[PDB]
Amino acid sequence: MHTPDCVTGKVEYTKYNDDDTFTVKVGDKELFTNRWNLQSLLLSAQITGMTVTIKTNACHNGGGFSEVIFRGSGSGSGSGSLKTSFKIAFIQARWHADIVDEARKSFVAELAAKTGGSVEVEIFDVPGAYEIPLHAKTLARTGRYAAIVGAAFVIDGGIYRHDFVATAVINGMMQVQLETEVPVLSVVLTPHHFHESKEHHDFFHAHFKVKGVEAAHAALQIVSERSRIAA
Amino acid sequence: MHTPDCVTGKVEYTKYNDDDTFTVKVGDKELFTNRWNLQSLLLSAQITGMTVTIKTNACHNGGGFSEVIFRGSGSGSGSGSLKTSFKIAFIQARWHADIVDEARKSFVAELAAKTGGSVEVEIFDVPGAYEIPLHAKTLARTGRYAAIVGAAFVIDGGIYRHDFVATAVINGMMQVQLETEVPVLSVVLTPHHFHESKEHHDFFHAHFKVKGVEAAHAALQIVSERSRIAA
Amino acid sequence: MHTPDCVTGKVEYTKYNDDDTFTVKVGDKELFTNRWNLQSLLLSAQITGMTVTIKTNACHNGGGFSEVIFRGSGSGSGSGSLKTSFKIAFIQARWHADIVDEARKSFVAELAAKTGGSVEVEIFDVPGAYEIPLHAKTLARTGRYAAIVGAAFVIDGGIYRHDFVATAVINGMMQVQLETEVPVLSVVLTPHHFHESKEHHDFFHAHFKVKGVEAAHAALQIVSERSRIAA
Amino acid sequence: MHTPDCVTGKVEYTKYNDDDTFTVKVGDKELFTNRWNLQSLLLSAQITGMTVTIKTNACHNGGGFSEVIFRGSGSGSGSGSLKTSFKIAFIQARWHADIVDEARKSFVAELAAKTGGSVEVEIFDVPGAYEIPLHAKTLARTGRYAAIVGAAFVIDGGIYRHDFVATAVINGMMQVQLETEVPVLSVVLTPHHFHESKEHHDFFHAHFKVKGVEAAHAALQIVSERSRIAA
Amino acid sequence: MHTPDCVTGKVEYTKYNDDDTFTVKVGDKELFTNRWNLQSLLLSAQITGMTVTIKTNACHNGGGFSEVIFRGSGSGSGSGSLKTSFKIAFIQARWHADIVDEARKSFVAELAAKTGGSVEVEIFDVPGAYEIPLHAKTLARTGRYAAIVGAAFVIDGGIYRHDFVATAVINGMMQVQLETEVPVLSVVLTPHHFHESKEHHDFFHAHFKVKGVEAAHAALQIVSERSRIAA
């Protein structure tokens, strides 16, 4: 009931001691309980990934407790302060890096101008576009990010067919988005023609800035809309 | 058994007290029970998302009870009154908004004319068509909606290939439809040619009204058919 | 052990009474038991969707029992008598209804001629082809049907691209078929050219009869083959 | 422990008797135990599909036991003797049967010549290529087969588009392969042109023999490789 | 608590003895415990695939124990020493083997030159590209590999359409990647034109070396990046 909180977070593990006591590690402190039903409750919570809150006056490793709060506290991964202070993960392929960097710089500059520094952008590098969905899924499952942006330049090199990889990447990004319930913005673009001539390079080098600005606006709007409909 | 109902709804959490009593939060009131088997029953119901109905004369927080109704009551999310009074969620992209707004207005006007105000339409904005499947999935899991409509105008801009995004959006909408068992109507249209000329603008501006009317009729018919086959 | 059966079917709900007794609703009658281990057994069976059979002399609501048959009895949904007497669900879109009706009539007539009335066909209407996979999934999960047939006419109208919807519908029908282990026959056809001229109308109006006869033969053959390999 | 084995196999069902004893059906014999913890153990094993081995001197229905081996024994479905003596399931569509039969005969003859009769081939008929993935999935879950081969001839008839069905069939075969962990060989072929002329018929009639020989070699190689990497 | 470790690993099976004792096989030694709650704990850990560590002075089969470590130890499959010493699995199809061998040799030579022998490459053979996703899924689930590379040469033979198989293979590789959380590099290439002439053979024979070097660099970079973001 009424007792100051000591630890709050997902159960790392549930241990059984020699004295028929249930030792459960919550947060940075290990605590043990002597209630037999609490053993099954903590085991089920750990199995189902349900967080518990243990409040006791002995906030130390190995301390005893008898009152457990099973109310929602995050159930594991989770982060975020206020509503306009969050983080965004930017994943960029390293093929045609001089063009993707334009979009990245435009995105970062526009976010800084709009939010005034309340939104933080983290940059991650991958070899190619095929590596983006798995990296996005790995980053999304840790919480810590309100949105994820993937940037790549997939072109037809004139030797091998390129549509298979682009289709797979787009489908995988959509699948990760639906799986993790975390928005994923797509800046993976496939031009109709790119013959690596001087004229082609300048055009897309200039256009990726506009693409980055559009992506920044879209990310801000979608995060705000999700926050609003989340009541 | 025979006892006036106090609370009815999904179990928010199941708490263990110091006196070996099981505190379960159902509805807006917290109640506790002293039956050891009821502890396991409530834990399993919460784990499997099975709703319970607790009836007692002490309809207040912390009250005691011994009789629990495990009959179906919604199992969490759920809404809807009668059969012709429901709600529809309309999701519209903001690219080429002047054309999509025609379909939205036609849809709303036709629904108002047909149902006479019994059906309510709620409008949600997303940056682009790529953001529609996740928004639809998020809205579907809350109940509260008998159908979901997604409207977008995906065109070929003459610079980048556009079929990947359209394919991903259609496939994702179908996947969400199959996952959540909630109908999703598609007003995501891809014209053969759109060169942003004056002639092209007027034609589709006019055609989206017909598209919206067709979507309204389809939504009404599909909701009625699902209600009928649900016995 | 040896006791005449009273109720056989899936457990609707498991109720705990004030006298530490487990009340379980099987079939149309509610019964209660006083075995503590039977409480956990029935709870697990309801959680895992495992049917139980309760045989007792008190075949009435609220009666007591002690012997439970946990042998396979259907595990919920299930229907079917003999091997040549089953039911088929026919789902038809309402776009170009005058052509789809030809296939439906041919299918019904051929089934009546072949089986002699042992096979029953039920007709369900949907607005368009996009609504077919969800309706098929909903109908398949109730048992009651040995096969499902979906009929639609998806054409290129000359304004919007149509391949996305056709691909989504075919993939969704395949996914539902693999998910529910119920055969789904496809009569969703996309012609190379259809310009709504008089010549085009008559040709497909005539061809859909042959398509329906072929679908009827295929459905009969596949149902017989599945029955045979099911040992 | 040390006791001669009586029955070994998956638990068909777990029954509770009137004398607080747990009756479990393993293999062709029904046996009961009086250990309360064994009741929960057997219930969990049946729920999770974990096989148990019951050894007792009373190898008869209704006999008692107290020692249970929970070591891996198959967990349900499973078959196979030695490493070069297995079975293969051949699924053939009945469209253009005169061409598919060439591949089937070539496959069977090559397998007989190579293995000398150690490998057995079973033939299953389906109406069309659309029926292959579900049949393959149904056959795979029974064990009893080290590989599955699907043969069909999908052509463009000049009236309706055919790529949707071929794409769905190939994707479904891959999905079943990944789901059931059973190799599925593809002999579903789509020619560039087939106008049902005399010249076209002979060419593919001759080529399907080579296709069948290639499929036989591939099946043998893949089964051997999986056996090798399975340690 | 404080006791030297004896066995650490996933629970192979949980056995119940005649003396109401729970025998659990961890690692290469079998041990039994007399704690009733430990029986349920070990059963749940085996069901959920949660590893346990048993530390006792009787490090032998059939020994007794009372203290169990439930802390994370691998939960089953898992391998890897340091951060620059890992293993890579190379899967190569046997169609056009003389071209794929160039990529394999280039990959191995570049890895040996870069890592100096700290990274080990294992080569697995499959009949065709269609067999790659299942082999990759089987190899990934055993741990033991930080990345998987699939190499194949899918060409248009001029008789049958080839895009279905390539699309299925790429999609399946992406699906396995997302399922198993193990990176999968794609060296499955489809040229625009390959007419088996002398000129075509030499060009791709030379280009596959560059492809292999690129794949080696990409694999090293992605493994390092995943290790870095794993904190």
UniProtKB/Swiss-Prot annotation, chains A, B, C, D, E:
Keywords: Cytoplasm, Riboflavin biosynthesis, Transferase. It catalyses: (2S)-2-hydroxy-3-oxobutyl phosphate + 5-amino-6-(D-ribitylamino)uracil = 6,7-dimethyl-8-(1-D-ribityl)lumazine + phosphate + 2 H2O + H(+). Could be useful as a specific antigen for the serological diagnosis of active infection of both human and bovine brucellosis. Has been used as a protein carrier of foreign peptides and proteins. The described characteristics of BLS make this protein an ideal antigen carrier for vaccine development. 5-amino-6-(D-ribitylamino)uracil binds at W95, A129, Y130, E131, F153, V154, I155, S186. GO terms for cellular component: cytosol; riboflavin synthase complex. Pathway: Cofactor biosynthesis; riboflavin biosynthesis; riboflavin from 2-hydroxy-3-oxobutyl phosphate and 5-amino-6-(D-ribitylamino)uracil: step 1/2. Gene3D superfamilies: Lumazine/riboflavin synthase. Its EC number is 2.5.1.78. It is found in: Cytoplasm. Induction: The two ribH genes may be differentially expressed during the Brucella infection cycle. Brucella would use RibH1 for flavin biosynthesis during the extracellular phase and RibH2 during intracellular growth. (2S)-2-hydroxy-3-oxobutyl phosphate binds at H200. The active site is at R161. GO terms for biological process: riboflavin biosynthetic process. GO terms for molecular function: 6,7-dimethyl-8-ribityllumazine synthase activity. It comes from the Bacteria. Belongs to the DMRL synthase family. Catalyzes the formation of 6,7-dimethyl-8-ribityllumazine by condensation of 5-amino-6-(D-ribitylamino)uracil with 3,4-dihydroxy-2-butanone 4-phosphate. This is the penultimate step in the biosynthesis of riboflavin. Displays low catalytic activity in comparison with the isozyme RibH1. Is a highly immunogenic protein. Activates dendritic cells (DCs) in vitro, increasing the levels of costimulatory molecules and the secretion of pro-inflammatory cytokines, and recruits DCs, B cells and CD8+ T cells in vivo, both effects in a TLR4-dependent manner. Homodecamer, arranged as a dimer of pentamers. This is 6,7-dimethyl-8-ribityllumazine synthase 2.
